[PDB]
Design a protein around this ligand. Structure first.
Ligand SMILES: CCCCCCCCCCCCCCCCCC(=O)OC[C@H](CO[C@@H]1O[C@H](CO[C@H]2O[C@H](CO)[C@H](O)[C@H](O)[C@H]2O)[C@H](O)[C@H](O)[C@H]1O)OC(=O)CCCCCCCCCCCCCCCCC
Ligand code: CLA
Ligand code: CLA
Ligand code: CLA
Ligand code: CLA
Ligand code: CLA
Ligand code: CLA
Ligand SMILES: CCCCCCCCCCCCCCCCCC(=O)OC[C@H](CO[C@@H]1O[C@H](CO)[C@H](O)[C@H](O)[C@H]1O)OC(=O)CCCCCCCCCCCCCCCCC
Ligand SMILES: CC1=C(/C=C/C(C)=C/C=CC(/C)=C/C=C/C=C(C)/C=C/C=C(C)/C=C/C2=C(C)CCCC2(C)C)C(C)(C)CCC1
Ligand SMILES: CC1=C(/C=C/C(C)=C/C=CC(/C)=C/C=C/C=C(C)\C=C\C=C(C)\C=C\C2=C(C)CCCC2(C)C)C(C)(C)CCC1
Ligand SMILES: CC1=C(C/C=C(\C)CCC[C@H](C)CCC[C@H](C)CCCC(C)C)C(=O)c2ccccc2C1=O
Ligand code: SF4
Ligand code: SF4
Lengths: 154, 42, 143, 80, 74, 733, 31, 74
């Protein structure tokens, strides 16, 4: 496949690592009582590990000679779920945060003592402002086009 | 009450409450969908 | 134009028990400083080098190894005890040099008998760059 | 001996003179401000380079500038 | 330096396991007397030798100690 | 004057020990010396260059003499792969008997040192075979250094010293250096390779006494002037060819194969001679560009001033740059250091992947030592280039003569440059450290499969584009019908593809996620060091915190505690802080190289692949793991040949640590301590009869920073060199 | 006769001694 | 408040009684970690049918020397 890697579902070292992990987890389980709280916790962890490995095989991740999943970020459409749509999600959230904070700073910049509203957050105004980050992708775009995103005269 | 609200919104207190809420939210999201290495929905 | 007071030996020195912060060989071969004041009453003050000393009634004379020490002592005498002081620089040859207050009035108060030294008639931002004074003995600020 | 310069932006506030710990600066008559005063540096040979005078100057940029130069036993503040 | 001395001396000449015949096997086989007199011995027989426990802690219940080891270095 | 230093009258009057210190640390700063002029400065620089050439020749002559005298060359050439080359003998009266026993190696009669500079392989490849050749080379080089000193002295004397106008003749100097220093020199090297080295690698021993009686080619110079040059490549050396013997030898003197010599695992000598001949032709042609006394050619300043884009996006373009470069010597030094550092790093990168000396690829410790050597020197050269750029800004820059040209416009938007470079550094550091810590925590919890392993897919694609076929990308050279592949199938691609796809050499190593992460660490280091240096340079002339910085010189302690405090505000201090980052970045580079190569030499590349993704792997599987033999160099049960490194390893640990002293504790404490010490000495019997003559004083602030940095760097270098050499030589694999 | 035996002390003890003495005399006295 | 926290953790989230039955056998522990992000590996096998983080504060010895035998007293 890409970069000489093979799918984890049909890879062999991936399955070997899965088996070894479960064996290691089970080794501890046999020491305690069959149905004690530690035994239940260890069983839950084993089930979690099995579910994790099955999901990794299901999503179609690529596994190297090491038997571990590898992430392709070149832009291949078969792997957009590895970096590109999480990347878009991060960009949206981070722009939300930055736009909300900038809106707060611009809103409080007109008082005689703006610093007072900076060490003591004016929550009433902040609660109204935080929701602009839902549509910041549009507000920032029209802010740039309208030419007042960037401070002229500087 | 009014002064309690004022002090309760000061930088340190507000930041700690915000980060406690964020930590709880992220913890719950991880708990429901743990071991997530990719975005499979689309 | 303010004849500076002449240093008067025989004036008593403050009561002091001795210290390891006194004069050294520099006083012997280079220079040392002497400060004099009046102090209306006998009282205990903090020495600029060691512990505490007591000013005698009437004139007091103290010899220090640094001018900065003399100035610190004078500042304490002027602000804490409200005493007028003057100090000199003494060379191993036997010379004495009146130092402060140079013209009878302390340097803080403007006096009509002082000329300007090292005053530039321009803002600090109008100095030439080093390239213009390169390979000449002058510095850009000396101009 | 360090070089101390007084620039014409001086407002004659006198704060630098109060600060010098070796009596290097002075106040002299002048006519370009309200105080008719300006700082002078006639005894830079006793300057130790502490730059305590510059910390007291309220003008922006400074009106008194200390340029550290050749070192002497007086400028190095040595008692031995 | 004091705590390093205490730890190495205790491991070398005091702490250990007793056996049926009374033969004491010390955690470190009494190498302090002969190895602690050089800096190379302190670097090798103390730091290098005894860091194996912490660096290997990954994959076990002591993994937190290795994490804190690296974080403290940072 | 009237005492040391005589070049500084202000320092000679300092009554303290400072006069001595600053007397030594400003001897080569001619511009700040009393009664300095233009011609004086240039003549001093010229003579110092002659002195440097003499020193270099003397040093290489000493290497030759010692290898010829206590060396192993005659024995080494008999079996290059199974005998350790000897540098020089050891005569230390402090050695004990077991030390003498342990240090006698290489078949010597006493304790000796095993050379790791790689001179044996280099001298063997070029044609030197016996100790007599080494002796002749050493004598010739001693003569050469003597002649260099004679030239320097001659040009010092009046009536031979060039004028300033001569020094500033840039066009003629460029013409001669391109067509003469570079072109003719490479032409001569190609001549030597054709006449001596290539015959030497085929059995014949061509020397001064018979090189006129031997034809380098059976049809000498006939093909060359007739134009039928292919006759010089008609019979290459067979792939079953032992190096210094005629078994399987050819007659071609120039070729272009591209692979390696199968036995020596190094480049073909004929290919190298052809390379040097070609680039000699290129340099000779290109060195006729500028105008001199013959009325044809180019004037550099006109080319510069004519390169101004319409639309004024670059302002006045390069107008006025010729005069600011020709008159500013620090500009010239900065440009030279920049280019030199770039090509030194290039040498480091190319020497390990395309070895040119026979049997050096099999000498692993030599390869590692050379790579680390050249990388550290390149880092120092780059840091120096930036330092001298800042120095030029301070001293030789004229704002009015550079009005609105590229330099002024660089100065006037420095803040955007600095801020964006800061953003790049922040991004790289944040995400690289985040991924490393994530993987490390993941392995702490026993779940390696949950790591964020990103495949360096772009680099793998580039490798595939070169012809490698381990990633299955099927790109140029790795495809089958691509024009790029088809164009060179008959020249060099056979050998090149044979070498690149062969996976026992270092020609384009296979890469994975660990390589991705470490390369991004490298990028972080480069960007942060560039940030520090660029910020120090562009703000050298002054900033908002100190607008009149240009009048305070390149290096000064501070501006006092006023205005919030002005510690480390000079450009010298920016360079000072950048040296730490340079050391850190080159350390990461060499750690990566050495770990990858030590795991490849063991046939255990997997181990690196698994353990590189997380930092604990670096700490345990590399530093702790490869440091057992070194620390065991000597122990309570005796010592072996590695003890000398084990000692140095500790020595480098001490120096570095004492460096932390001058960097943390500052002047005032030490000054007061020295004052009380002076009192004590003056107050004691029998010793007050002895009197110091320079008043003791604590080290200056700038001097203390410099001394601390020097300790830091010396300890860094010594400890890493000890570790690298002991670990690679301990295994010899 | 062992050439190293003569020179190692010469360059490690005699040479530094004479050089340090001469340079101390040069640096440390009024001219 | 710190001491009260100590005693409460020893009372509820500890294997104090198991250690009391066999001191040399069980390794003292008075802290467990919730299973959230795979950190439950830190709940190591300390003996006495308990999984937690081993404590080196020496509280178990103090409680034994004081005469505390049950968790009601803690
Ligand atoms: C499924 C298919 C259909 C989808 C339809 C979706 C619709 C959008 C989602 C939900 C709509 C219902 C929301 C609850 C109703 C009350 C909201 C409101 O009117 O609440 C009133 C506010 C007022 O809005 C604007 O608020 C701005 C800021 O004012 C104030 O903002 C703060 C308000 O607390 C402070 O008072 C602050 O001092 C002051 O600046 C403007 O200047 C004006 O005051 C006002 O026009 O709306 C606010 O944004 C309050 C914050 C919540 C807004 C949520 C928007 C969606 C994201
Ligand atoms: C381990 C040692 C260390 C570390 C980690 C750093 C890290 C950094 N240095 Mg630095 N430096 C060091 C040693 C170090 N330096 C030394 C010894 C010197 C010689 C004096 C210098 C001199 C130096 C200079 C001159 C400069 C830097 C700069 C920087 C920053 C570059 C920007 C970057 O990479 O993004 C970030 C890199 C990171 C490693 C992120 C650190 C923060 C992480 C995410 C932790 C977050 C906190 C976390 C939530 C836990 C909080 C705990 C709670 C109790 C608060 C960076 C933060 C440059 C700079 O400032 O950038 C503009 C700069 O100019 N360094
Ligand atoms: C810079 C090159 C260089 C270097 C690094 C060394 C280094 C060394 N030499 Mg050596 N040497 C050299 C050149 C060099 N040599 C040359 C050109 C000759 C003449 C062919 C010799 C002849 C020589 C002999 C006979 C011996 C050594 C020996 C030694 C070793 C012990 C110290 C010693 O005896 O001092 C060096 C002794 C000398 C007599 C050197 C004189 C020759 C040069 C011209 C002196 C340079 C002085 C100059 C002012 C400074 C140079 C610039 C800079 C490096 C400071 C030591 C590792 C001894 C040894 O074998 O080790 C066990 C020994 O007995 N050398
Ligand atoms: C740049 C650094 C970096 C990056 C990129 C990651 C990335 C990741 N980490 Mg990690 N981590 C880091 C640093 C980093 N970490 C450090 C420094 C530590 C030490 C404290 C950890 C410790 C850590 C742990 C213990 C775990 C992770 C886990 C994860 C993965 C979980 C994704 C998730 O939470 O689901 C998705 C989350 C969301 C979708 C939340 C956003 C949705 C919002 C709230 C709604 C938006 C609506 C529109 C993810 C790939 C988890 C994992 O399972 O790894 C595979 C996990 O167990 N990390
Ligand atoms: C600066 C480099 C250099 C130098 C000094 C020499 C010098 C010499 N070469 Mg040589 N050569 C060189 C480079 C060099 N070569 C290179 C790069 C190649 C590879 C193409 C050759 C290939 C070569 C061959 C095949 C032969 C020589 C030969 C010779 C010798 C006689 C050449 C002659 O006079 O014929 C005539 C010279 C001219 C007509 C002048 C040429 C016009 C110039 C460029 C102006 C002579 C000592 C010949 C020999 O017998 O060796 C002893 C011989 O046959 N050379
Ligand atoms: C062709 C290369 C070259 C040249 C010609 C110059 C030339 C010059 N440099 Mg420069 N520089 C260079 C490269 C170069 N540099 C590089 C690569 C760097 C990066 C490190 C620097 C960084 C640098 C700085 C920061 C400064 C200069 C300065 C100067 C000027 C005065 C130097 C002087 O006299 O100080 C005297 C010489 C010394 C103090 C050197 C003695 C101390 C060294 C570092 C100790 C050596 C290490 C140690 C002994 C080895 C270990 C010992 C043992 C254990 C083995 C001068 C014109 C200074 C200047 O004033 O600019 C105008 C200045 O401040 N340079
Ligand atoms: C490895 C790092 C290192 C080292 C070696 C030292 C060493 C020293 N520190 Mg120190 N210190 C350090 C780090 C270090 N420090 C750091 C990082 C800080 C920052 C917090 C400090 C802050 C600090 C302070 C504030 C003070 C010291 C003081 C001292 C000195 C104490 C006097 C003494 O021990 O007598 C003897 C010296 C030693 C035992 C050191 C090694 C000497 C070797 C064994 C002798 C070798 C001689 C050899 C034959 C020489 C021949 C070589 C020839 C070629 C020249 C001593 C020299 C104190 C001091 O100055 O004393 C009054 C002091 O006040 N340090
Ligand atoms: C998809 C990712 C890419 C998005 C690109 C968005 C469009 C960018 C082009 C338009 C930018 C713009 O109009 O503003 C251009 C901005 C300033 O914006 C300008 O401001 C002016 C003064 O107010 C006017 O209002 C103009 O209408 C306005 O465009 O300046 C620049 O970015 C320089 C570019 C050349 C102009
Ligand atoms: C500060 C300063 C200075 C300096 C600076 C510097 C030094 C910088 C730098 C820099 C650098 C050091 C850079 C580098 C670079 C490089 C580049 C930019 C490149 C490139 C590219 C290309 C062109 C490519 C091509 C190719 C080919 C050919 C083929 C194969 C592939 C490749 C891609 C490789 C001075 C003194 C002057 C002045 C003042 C200022
Ligand atoms: C696709 C991709 C890629 C790449 C890419 C690239 C390379 C590009 C780019 C890019 C670029 C070139 C960018 C840029 C930019 C620029 C600028 C100039 C900007 C800006 C912005 C701003 C300024 C903003 C601001 C703000 C916001 C909006 C947010 C919040 C608020 C604030 C205000 C902060 C890769 C392959 C890797 C992978 C896959 C994906
Ligand atoms: C120790 C120390 C001192 C005191 C250092 C002194 C007094 C130096 C004393 C060293 C003596 C002279 C012996 C040094 C031996 C050297 C190896 C000799 C080098 C001389 C030539 C070979 C270059 C400072 O003055 C100081 C100032 C500012 C910041 C940090 C510090 C600081 O750390
Ligand atoms: S630097 Fe200090 S001593 Fe010198 S003039 Fe200023 S205040 Fe006075
Ligand atoms: S402090 Fe500045 S403004 Fe005030 S008198 Fe002195 S120089 Fe003038």
């Amino acid at each position: 496949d890409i970069a000489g890697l093979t799918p984890c579902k049909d890879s062999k070292q991936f399955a070997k690592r899965e088996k070894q992990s479960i064996k290691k987890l089970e080794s501890s389980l046999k020491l305690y009582a069959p149905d004690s709280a530690p035994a239940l916790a260890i069983n839950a962890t084993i089930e979690k590990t099995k579910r994790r490995f099955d999901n990794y095989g299901k999503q179609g991740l690529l596994c190297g000679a090491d038997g571990l999943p590898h992430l392709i970020v070149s832009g291949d459409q078969r792997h957009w779920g590895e970096f590109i749509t999480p990347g878009i999600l991060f960009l949206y959230i981070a722009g939300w945060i930055g736009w909300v904070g900038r809106s707060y700073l611009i809103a409080i910049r007109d008082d005689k003592k703006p610093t007072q509203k900076e060490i003591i957050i004016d929550v009433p105004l902040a609660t109204g402002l935080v929701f602009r980050g839902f549509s910041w992708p549009i507000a920032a775009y029209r802010e740039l086009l309208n030419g007042e995103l960037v401070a002229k005269d500087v | 009450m009014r002064d309690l609200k004022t002090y309760l919104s000061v930088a340190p207190v507000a930041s700690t409450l915000w980060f406690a809420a964020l930590a709880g939210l992220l913890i719950e999201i991880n708990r429901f969908f743990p071991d997530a290495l990719t975005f499979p929905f689309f | 134009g303010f004849t500076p007071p002449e240093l008067d030996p025989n004036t008593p020195s403050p009561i002091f028990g001795g210290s390891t912060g006194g004069l050294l060989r520099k006083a012997q071969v280079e220079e040392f400083y002497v400060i004099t004041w009046e102090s209306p009453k006998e009282q205990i003050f903090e020495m600029p080098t060691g512990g505490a000393a007591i000013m005698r009634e009437g004139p007091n004379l103290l010899k220090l190894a640094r001018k900065e020490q003399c100035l610190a002592l004078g500042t304490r005498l002027r602000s804490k005890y409200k005493i007028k002081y003057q100090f000199y620089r003494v060379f191993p040859s036997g010379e004495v040099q009146y130092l402060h207050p140079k013209d009878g009035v302390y340097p803080e108060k403007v006096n009509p008998g002082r000329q300007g030294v090292g005053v530039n008639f321009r803002s600090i931002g109008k100095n030439v760059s080093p390239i213009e004074v390169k390979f000449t003995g002058k510095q850009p600020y000396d101009l | 001996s360090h070089s101390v310069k007084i620039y014409d932006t001086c407002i004659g506030c006198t704060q630098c003179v109060r600060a010098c710990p070796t009596d290097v600066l002075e106040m002299i008559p002048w006519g370009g401000c309200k105080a008719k005063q300006i700082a002078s540096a006639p005894r830079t040979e006793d300057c130790v380079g502490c730059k305590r005078c510059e910390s007291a100057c309220p003008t922006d940029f400074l009106s008194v500038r200390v340029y550290l130069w050749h070192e002497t036993t007086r400028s190095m503040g040595l008692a031995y | 330096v004091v705590i390093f001395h205490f730890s190495w001396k205790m491991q070398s000449d005091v702490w250990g396991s007793i056996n049926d015949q009374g033969v004491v096997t010390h955690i470190t086989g009494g190498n302090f007397a002969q190895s602690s007199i050089t800096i190379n011995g302190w670097l090798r027989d103390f730091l290098w030798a005894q860091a194996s426990q912490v660096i290997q802690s990954y994959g076990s219940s002591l993994s937190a100690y290795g994490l804190f080891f690296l974080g403290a270095h940072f | 004057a009237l005492r040391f230093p005589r070049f500084s009258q202000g320092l000679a009057q300092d009554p303290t020990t400072r006069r001595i210190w600053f007397g030594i640390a400003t001897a080569h700063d001619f511009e700040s010396h009393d009664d300095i002029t233009e011609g004086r400065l240039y003549q001093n620089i010229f003579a110092s260059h002659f002195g440097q050439l003499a020193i270099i020749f003397l040093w290489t002559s000493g290497n030759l003499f010692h290898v010829a005298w206590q060396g192993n060359f005659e024995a080494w050439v008999q079996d290059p792969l199974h005998v350790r080359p000897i540098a020089h003998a050891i005569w230390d009266p402090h050695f004990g008997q077991p030390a003498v026993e342990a240090f006698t190696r290489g078949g010597a009669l006493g304790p000796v040192n095993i050379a790791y500079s790689g001179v044996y392989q280099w001298w063997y490849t070029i044609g030197l075979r016996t100790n007599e050749d080494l002796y002749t080379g050493a004598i010739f080089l001693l003569f050469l250094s003597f002649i260099s000193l004679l030239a320097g002295w001659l040009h010092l004397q009046p009536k031979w010293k060039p004028s300033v106008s001569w020094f500033k003749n840039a066009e003629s100097r460029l013409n001669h250096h391109l067509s003469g220093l570079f072109g003719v020199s490479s032409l001569a090297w190609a001549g030597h390779l054709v006449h001596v080295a290539i015959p030497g690698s085929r059995g014949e021993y061509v020397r001064w006494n018979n090189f006129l009686s031997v034809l380098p080619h059976p049809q000498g110079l006939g093909p060359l002037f007739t134009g039928q040059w292919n006759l010089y490549a008609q019979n290459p050396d067979s792939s079953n060819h032992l190096f210094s013997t005629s078994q399987g030898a050819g007659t071609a003197i120039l070729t272009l194969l591209g692979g390696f010599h199968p036995q020596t695992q190094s480049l073909w000598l004929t290919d190298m001679a052809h390379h040097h001949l070609a680039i000699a032709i290129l340099f000779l042609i290109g060195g006729h560009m500028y105008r001199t006394n013959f009325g044809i050619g180019h004037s550099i300043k006109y080319i510069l001033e004519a390169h101004i884009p319409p639309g004024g996006r670059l302002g006045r373009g390069h107008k006025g740059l010729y005069d600011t470069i020709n008159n500013s010597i620090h500009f010239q030094l900065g440009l030279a250091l920049a280019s030199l550092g770039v090509i030194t790093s290039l040498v480091a990168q190319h020497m390990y992947s395309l070895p040119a000396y026979a049997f050096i690829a099999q000498d692993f410790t030599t390869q590692a030592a050379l790579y680390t050597h050249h990388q550290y020197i390149a880092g120092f050269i780059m840091t120096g280039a930036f330092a001298h750029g800042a120095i030029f800004f301070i001293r030789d820059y004229n704002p009015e003569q550079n009005a609105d040209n590229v330099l002024a416009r660089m100065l006037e938007h420095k803040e955007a440059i600095i801020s964006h470079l800061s953003w790049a550094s922040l991004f790289l550091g944040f995400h690289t450290l985040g991924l490393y810590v994530h993987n490390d925590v993941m392995l702490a919890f026993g779940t390696p499969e949950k790591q964020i392993l990103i495949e360096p897919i772009f680099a793998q694609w580039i490798q595939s584009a070169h012809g490698k076929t381990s990633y299955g990308f099927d790109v140029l050279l790795s495809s089958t019908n691509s024009p790029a592949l088809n164009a060179g199938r008959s020249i060099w691609l056979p050998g090149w593809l044979n070498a690149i796809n062969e996976n026992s050499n270092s020609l384009f190593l296979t890469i994975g996620p660990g390589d991705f992460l470490v390369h991004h660490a490298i990028a972080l280091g480069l960007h942060t060091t560039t940030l520090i240096l660029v910020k120090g340079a562009l703000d050298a002339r002054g900033s908002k915190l100190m607008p009149d910085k240009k009048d305070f010189g390149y290096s000064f302690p501070c501006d006092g505690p006023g205005r919030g405090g002005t510690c480390d505000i000079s450009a010298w201090d920016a360079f000072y802080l950048a040296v730490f980052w340079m050391l850190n970045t080159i350390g990461w580079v060499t750690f990566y190289w050495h770990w990858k190569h030590i795991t490849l030499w063991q046939g255990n590349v997997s181990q690196f692949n698994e353990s590189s993704t997380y930092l604990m792997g670096w700490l345990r599987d590399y530093l702790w793991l490869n440091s057992s033999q070194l620390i065991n160099g000597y122990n309570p049960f005796g010592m072996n040949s590695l003890s000398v490194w084990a000692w140095m390893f500790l020595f480098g640990h001490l120096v570095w640590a004492t460096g932390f002293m001058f960097l943390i504790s500052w002047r005032g404490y030490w000054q007061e301590l020295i004052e009380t010490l002076a009192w004590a000495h003056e107050r004691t019997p029998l010793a007050n009869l002895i009197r110091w003559r320079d008043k003791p004083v604590a080290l200056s602030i700038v001097q203390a920073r410099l001394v601390g940095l020097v300790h830091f760097s010396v300890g860094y270098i010594f400890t890493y060199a000890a570790f690298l050499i002991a670990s690679t030589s301990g295994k010899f694999g | 006769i062992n050439l190293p035996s003569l020179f190692v002390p010469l360059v490690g003890l005699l040479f530094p001694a004479v050089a340090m003495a001469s340079l101390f005399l040069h640096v440390e006295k009024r001219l | 408040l710190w001491l009260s926290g100590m005693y409460f953790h020893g009372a509820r989230f500890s294997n104090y009684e198991a250690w009391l039955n066999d001191p040399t056998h069980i390794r003292p522990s008075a802290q467990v970690v919730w299973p959230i992000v795979g950190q439950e590996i830190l709940n190591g096998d300390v003996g006495g049918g308990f999984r937690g983080i081993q404590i080196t504060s020496g509280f178990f010895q103090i409680w034994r020397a004081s005469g505390i035998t049950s968790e009601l007293q803690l």
